[PDB]
mmCIF file of C-alpha atoms in Angstrom:
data_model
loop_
_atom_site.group_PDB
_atom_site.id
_atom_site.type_symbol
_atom_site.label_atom_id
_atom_site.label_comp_id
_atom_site.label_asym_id
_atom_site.label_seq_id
_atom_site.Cartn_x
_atom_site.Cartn_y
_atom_site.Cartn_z
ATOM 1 C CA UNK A 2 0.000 0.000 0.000
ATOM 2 C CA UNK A 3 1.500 3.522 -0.988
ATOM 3 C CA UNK A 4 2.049 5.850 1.824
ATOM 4 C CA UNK A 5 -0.460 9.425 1.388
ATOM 5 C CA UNK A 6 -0.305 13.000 2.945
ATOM 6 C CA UNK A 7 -3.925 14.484 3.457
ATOM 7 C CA UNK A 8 -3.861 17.837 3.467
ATOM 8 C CA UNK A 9 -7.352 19.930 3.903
ATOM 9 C CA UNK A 10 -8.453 23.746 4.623
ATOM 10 C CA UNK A 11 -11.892 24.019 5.597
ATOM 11 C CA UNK A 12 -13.631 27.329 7.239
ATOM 12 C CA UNK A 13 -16.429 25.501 8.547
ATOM 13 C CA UNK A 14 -15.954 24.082 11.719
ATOM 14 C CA UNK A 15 -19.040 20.806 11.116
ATOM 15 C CA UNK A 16 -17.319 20.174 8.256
ATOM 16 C CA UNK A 17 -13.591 20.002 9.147
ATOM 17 C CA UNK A 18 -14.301 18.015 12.235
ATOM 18 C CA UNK A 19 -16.097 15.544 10.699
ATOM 19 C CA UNK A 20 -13.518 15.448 8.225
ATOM 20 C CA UNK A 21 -10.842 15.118 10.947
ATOM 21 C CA UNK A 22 -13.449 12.237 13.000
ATOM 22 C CA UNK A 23 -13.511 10.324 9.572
ATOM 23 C CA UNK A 24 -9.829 10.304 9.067
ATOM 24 C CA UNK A 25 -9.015 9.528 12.295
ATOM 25 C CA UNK A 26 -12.127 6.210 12.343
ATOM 26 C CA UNK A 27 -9.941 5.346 9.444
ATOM 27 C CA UNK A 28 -7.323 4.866 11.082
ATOM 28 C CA UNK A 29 -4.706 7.741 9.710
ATOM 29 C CA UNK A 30 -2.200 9.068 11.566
ATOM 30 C CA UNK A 31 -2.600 13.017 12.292
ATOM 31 C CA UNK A 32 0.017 14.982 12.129
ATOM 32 C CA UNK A 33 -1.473 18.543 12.533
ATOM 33 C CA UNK A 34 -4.459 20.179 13.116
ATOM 34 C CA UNK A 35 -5.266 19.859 8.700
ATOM 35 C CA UNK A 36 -3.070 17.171 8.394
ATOM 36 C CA UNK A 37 -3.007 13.296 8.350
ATOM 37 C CA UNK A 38 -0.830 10.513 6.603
ATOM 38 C CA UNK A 39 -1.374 6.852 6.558
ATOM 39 C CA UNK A 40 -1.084 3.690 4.205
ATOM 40 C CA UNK A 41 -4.437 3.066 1.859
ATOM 41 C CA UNK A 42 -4.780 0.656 -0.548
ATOM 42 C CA UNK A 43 -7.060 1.216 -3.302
ATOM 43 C CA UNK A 44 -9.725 -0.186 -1.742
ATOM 44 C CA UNK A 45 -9.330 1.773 1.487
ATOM 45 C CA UNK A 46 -8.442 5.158 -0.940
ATOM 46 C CA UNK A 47 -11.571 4.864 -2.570
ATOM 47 C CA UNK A 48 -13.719 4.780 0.524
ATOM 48 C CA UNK A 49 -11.278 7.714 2.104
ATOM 49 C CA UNK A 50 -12.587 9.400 -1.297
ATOM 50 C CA UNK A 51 -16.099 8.632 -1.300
ATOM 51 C CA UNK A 52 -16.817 9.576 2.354
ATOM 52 C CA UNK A 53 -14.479 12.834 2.088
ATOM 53 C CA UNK A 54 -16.648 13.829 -0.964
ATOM 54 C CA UNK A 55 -19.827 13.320 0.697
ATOM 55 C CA UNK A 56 -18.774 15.932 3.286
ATOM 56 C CA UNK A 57 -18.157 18.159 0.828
ATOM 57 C CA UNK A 58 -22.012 17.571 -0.935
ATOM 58 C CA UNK A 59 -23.346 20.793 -0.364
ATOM 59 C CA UNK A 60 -22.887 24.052 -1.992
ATOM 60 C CA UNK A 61 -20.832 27.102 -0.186
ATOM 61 C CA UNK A 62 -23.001 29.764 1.070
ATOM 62 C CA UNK A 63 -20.172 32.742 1.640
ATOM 63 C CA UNK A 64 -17.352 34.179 -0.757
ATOM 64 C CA UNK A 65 -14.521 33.224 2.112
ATOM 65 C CA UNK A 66 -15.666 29.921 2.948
ATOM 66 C CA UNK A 67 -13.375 27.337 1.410
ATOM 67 C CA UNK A 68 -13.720 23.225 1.246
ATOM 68 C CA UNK A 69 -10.485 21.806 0.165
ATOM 69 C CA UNK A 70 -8.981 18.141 0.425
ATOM 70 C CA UNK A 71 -5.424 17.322 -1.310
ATOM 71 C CA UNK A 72 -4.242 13.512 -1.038
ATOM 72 C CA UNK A 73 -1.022 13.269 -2.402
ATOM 73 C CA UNK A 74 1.234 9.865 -2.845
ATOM 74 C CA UNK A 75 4.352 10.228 -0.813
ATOM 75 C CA UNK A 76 7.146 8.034 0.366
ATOM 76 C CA UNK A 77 8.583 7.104 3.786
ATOM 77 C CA UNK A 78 11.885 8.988 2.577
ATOM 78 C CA UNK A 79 10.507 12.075 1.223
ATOM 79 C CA UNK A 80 7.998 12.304 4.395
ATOM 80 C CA UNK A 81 11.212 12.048 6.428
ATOM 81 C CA UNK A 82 12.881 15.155 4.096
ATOM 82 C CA UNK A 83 10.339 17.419 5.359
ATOM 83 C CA UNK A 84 10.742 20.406 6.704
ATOM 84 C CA UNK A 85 7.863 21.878 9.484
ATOM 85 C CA UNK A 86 7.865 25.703 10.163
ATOM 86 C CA UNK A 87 6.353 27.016 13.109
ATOM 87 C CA UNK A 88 6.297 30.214 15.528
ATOM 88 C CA UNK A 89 9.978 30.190 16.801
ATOM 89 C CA UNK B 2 16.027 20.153 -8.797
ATOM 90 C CA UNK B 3 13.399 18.291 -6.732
ATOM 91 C CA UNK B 4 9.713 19.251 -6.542
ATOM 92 C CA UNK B 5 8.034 20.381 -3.505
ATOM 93 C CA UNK B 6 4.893 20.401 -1.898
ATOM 94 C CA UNK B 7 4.201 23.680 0.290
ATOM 95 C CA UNK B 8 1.564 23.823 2.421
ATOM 96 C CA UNK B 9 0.912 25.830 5.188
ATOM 97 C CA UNK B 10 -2.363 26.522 7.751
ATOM 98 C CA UNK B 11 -1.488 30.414 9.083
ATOM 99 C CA UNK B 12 -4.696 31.990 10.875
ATOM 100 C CA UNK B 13 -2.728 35.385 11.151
ATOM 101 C CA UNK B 14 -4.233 37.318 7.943
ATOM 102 C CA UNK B 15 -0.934 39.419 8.091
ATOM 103 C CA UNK B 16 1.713 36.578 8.363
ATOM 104 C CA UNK B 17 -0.221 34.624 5.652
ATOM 105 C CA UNK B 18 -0.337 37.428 3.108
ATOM 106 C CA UNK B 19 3.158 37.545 3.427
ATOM 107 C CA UNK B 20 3.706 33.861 3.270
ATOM 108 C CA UNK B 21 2.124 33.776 0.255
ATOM 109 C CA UNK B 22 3.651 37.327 -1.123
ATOM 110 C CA UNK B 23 7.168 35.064 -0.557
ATOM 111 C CA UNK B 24 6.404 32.469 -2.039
ATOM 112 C CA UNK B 25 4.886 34.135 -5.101
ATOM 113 C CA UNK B 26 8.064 35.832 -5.548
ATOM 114 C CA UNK B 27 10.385 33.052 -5.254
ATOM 115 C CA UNK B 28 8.112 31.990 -8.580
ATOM 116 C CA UNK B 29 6.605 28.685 -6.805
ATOM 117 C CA UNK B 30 3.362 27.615 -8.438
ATOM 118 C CA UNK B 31 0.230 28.815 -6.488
ATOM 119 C CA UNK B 32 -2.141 25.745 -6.233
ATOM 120 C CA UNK B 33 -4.542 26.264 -3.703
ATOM 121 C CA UNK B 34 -5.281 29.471 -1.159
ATOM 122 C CA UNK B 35 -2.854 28.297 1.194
ATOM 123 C CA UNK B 36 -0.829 25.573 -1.213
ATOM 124 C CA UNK B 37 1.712 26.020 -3.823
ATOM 125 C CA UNK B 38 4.285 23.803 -5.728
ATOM 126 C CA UNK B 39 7.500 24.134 -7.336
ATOM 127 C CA UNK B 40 10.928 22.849 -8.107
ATOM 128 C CA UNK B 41 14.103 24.428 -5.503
ATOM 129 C CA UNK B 42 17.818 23.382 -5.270
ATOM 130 C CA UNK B 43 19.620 23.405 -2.422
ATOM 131 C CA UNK B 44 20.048 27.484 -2.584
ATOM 132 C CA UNK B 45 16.626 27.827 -3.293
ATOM 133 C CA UNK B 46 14.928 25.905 -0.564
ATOM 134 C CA UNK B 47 17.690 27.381 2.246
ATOM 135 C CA UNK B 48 16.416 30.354 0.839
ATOM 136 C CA UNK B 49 12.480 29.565 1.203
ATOM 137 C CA UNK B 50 13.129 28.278 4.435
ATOM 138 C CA UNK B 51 15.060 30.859 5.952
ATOM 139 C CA UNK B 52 12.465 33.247 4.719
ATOM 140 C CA UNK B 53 9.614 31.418 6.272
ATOM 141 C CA UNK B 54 11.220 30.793 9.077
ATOM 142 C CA UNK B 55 11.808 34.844 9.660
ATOM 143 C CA UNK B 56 7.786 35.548 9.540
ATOM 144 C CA UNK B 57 7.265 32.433 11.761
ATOM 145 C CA UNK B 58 9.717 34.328 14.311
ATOM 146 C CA UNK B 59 6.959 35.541 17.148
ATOM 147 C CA UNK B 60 5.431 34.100 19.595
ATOM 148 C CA UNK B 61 1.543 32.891 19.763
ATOM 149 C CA UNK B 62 -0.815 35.180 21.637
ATOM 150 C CA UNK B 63 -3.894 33.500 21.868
ATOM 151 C CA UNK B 64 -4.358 29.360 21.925
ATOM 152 C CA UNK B 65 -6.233 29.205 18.851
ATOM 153 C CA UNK B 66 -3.880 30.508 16.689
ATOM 154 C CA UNK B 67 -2.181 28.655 14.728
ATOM 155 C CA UNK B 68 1.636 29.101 12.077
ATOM 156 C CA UNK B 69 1.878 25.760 10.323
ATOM 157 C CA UNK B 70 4.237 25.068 7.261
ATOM 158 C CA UNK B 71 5.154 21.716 6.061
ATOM 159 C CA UNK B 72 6.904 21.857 3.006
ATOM 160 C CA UNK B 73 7.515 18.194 1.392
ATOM 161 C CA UNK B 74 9.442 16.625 -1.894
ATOM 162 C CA UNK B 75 7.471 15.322 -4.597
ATOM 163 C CA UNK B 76 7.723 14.041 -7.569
ATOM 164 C CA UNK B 77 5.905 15.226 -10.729
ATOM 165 C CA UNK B 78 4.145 11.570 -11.580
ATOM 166 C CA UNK B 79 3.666 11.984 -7.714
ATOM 167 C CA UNK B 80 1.355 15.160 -7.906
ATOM 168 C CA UNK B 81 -0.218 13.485 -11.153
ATOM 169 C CA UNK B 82 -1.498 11.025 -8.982
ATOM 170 C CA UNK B 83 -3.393 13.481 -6.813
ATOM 171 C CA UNK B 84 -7.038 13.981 -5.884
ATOM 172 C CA UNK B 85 -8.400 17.267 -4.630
ATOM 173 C CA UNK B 86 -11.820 17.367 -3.003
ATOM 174 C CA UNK B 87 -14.050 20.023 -3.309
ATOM 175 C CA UNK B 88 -17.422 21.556 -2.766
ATOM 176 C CA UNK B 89 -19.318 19.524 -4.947
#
């Protein structure tokens, strides 16, 4: 199974915790507030897709709300090349 | 040079305009609101980082807020492979 980084920004508050509840009942690893990473095979991607889209089954209602989910193939090495930035 | 992934979650409007203003003008790719792409050497990503790591350099002042920047290498059949969720 190929390793994936989840990435997601989400003004709604509902919606990005029951995005972060569904990641986590799927047993990803999160790594920051809008991020998780895990193994999924394609039949464990698909359903990450399927239920992620559902979430997102409505229409936005404001200019500066935004629903957005990136799932991006990585591997083990290039997750360990990262760099994190924070207040310092 | 190696591809990178850059994204960041930065509730300061301030510190994120000029996250992004950086970014734009080290020519990385703009792919979401708060996500862009591009290719960086070794000069070039000491250079992003540094950078980044100069607006990051405050400290928090109230427990919701939130500087986040992971920036990770990709590959380009890597970022083919993505999905991006949406409002739908």
């Amino acid at each position: 199974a190929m390793l994936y980084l989840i990435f997601y920004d989400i003004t709604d508050d509902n919606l990005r915790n029951r995005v972060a509840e569904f990641l986590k009942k799927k047993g990803l690893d999160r790594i920051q507030y809008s991020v998780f990473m895990g193994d999924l095979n394609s039949s464990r991607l698909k359903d990450v897709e399927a239920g992620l889209k559902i979430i997102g089954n409505r229409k936005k209602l404001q200019e500066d709300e935004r629903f957005f989910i990136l799932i991006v193939p990585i591997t083990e090495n290039q997750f360990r090349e990262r760099i994190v930035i924070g207040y310092s």
